[PDB]
Amino acid sequence: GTSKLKYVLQDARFFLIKSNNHENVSLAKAKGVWSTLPVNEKKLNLAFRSARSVILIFSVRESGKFQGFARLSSESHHIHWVLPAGMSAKMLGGVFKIDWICRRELPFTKSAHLTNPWNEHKPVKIGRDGQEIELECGTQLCLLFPPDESIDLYQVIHKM
Numbered sequence: 001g002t003s004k005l006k007y008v009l010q011d012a013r014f015f016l017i018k019s020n021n022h023e024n025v026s027l028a029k030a031k032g033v034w035s036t037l038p039v040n041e042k043k044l045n046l047a048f049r050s051a052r053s054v055i056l057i058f059s060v061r062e063s064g065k066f067q068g069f070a071r072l073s074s075e076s077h078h079i080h081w082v083l084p085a086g087m088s089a090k091m092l093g094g095v096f097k098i099d100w101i102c103r104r105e106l107p108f109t110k111s112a113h114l115t116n117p118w119n120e121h122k123p124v125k126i127g128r129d130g131q132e133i134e135l136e137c138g139t140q141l142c143l144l145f146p147p148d149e150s151i152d153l154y155q156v157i158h159k160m
C-alpha cells in the first residue's frame with residue numbers, strides 16, 4: 001500500500017541530488033549514507049532541523065532516470081567515493097545518515113508532467129545538485145516511483 005509512504009511524505013521537504021556516477025549511489029544504497037558539497041551540506045543541515053522529513057531524490061547524471069529516494073536520519077558528521085575530475089575528498093567530508101524509502105528507478109519520461117515552482121516551473125528532472133523541490137511536486141514525484149516491497153516504513157516512521 002501507499003498510506004505509510006504518504007504519511008512519511010507529509011509536510012516533507014524535498015531536494016534533488018545529482019550524482020556524477022552510479023558507484024556513489026550504489027554505495028549510498030549499501031551503506032545508508034550520503035555526502036555532498038559544502039554549499040548543499042549547509043542547506044540540508046538547516047532543512048533537517050526545519051521539517052519532519054527531508055527527502056533526497058537521487059539522479060545519476062546522463063542516466064535519464066532517478067535511482068530512488070531516501071529520508072535524512074541525521075545532520076552531517078565527520079567512505080570510498082569515486083570523485084569527479086578535479087573533485088577532491090575534503091569537499092565531500094560531511095556524511096549524512098539516510099534511510100531509503102525506494103531503491104527502484106523512475107525514468108524521466110514518467111515525470112514529464114511535473115514542474116518545480118522553485119526552478120522556474122521547469123520539469124522536475126531539471127536542476128542542479130541540491131535544488132529544492134516544492135512540496136506538491138516532490139510528493140507527486142515520489143508517488144510515481146514503483147513500490148519497493150523490500151522496505152518497511154515502520155522503522156522510518158519511528159525515527160520521526
Ligand SMILES: CNc1nc(Cl)nc2c1ncn2Cc1ccncc1
Pocket residue numbers: 018019020021024034035036037081082083084087092129
Ligand atoms: C558522494 N557525493 C557525491 N558523489 C558524486 Cl560522484 N557526485 C556528487 C556528490 N555530491 C554532489 N555531486 C555532484 C557534484 C556537482 C559539482 N561538483 C562535484 C560533485
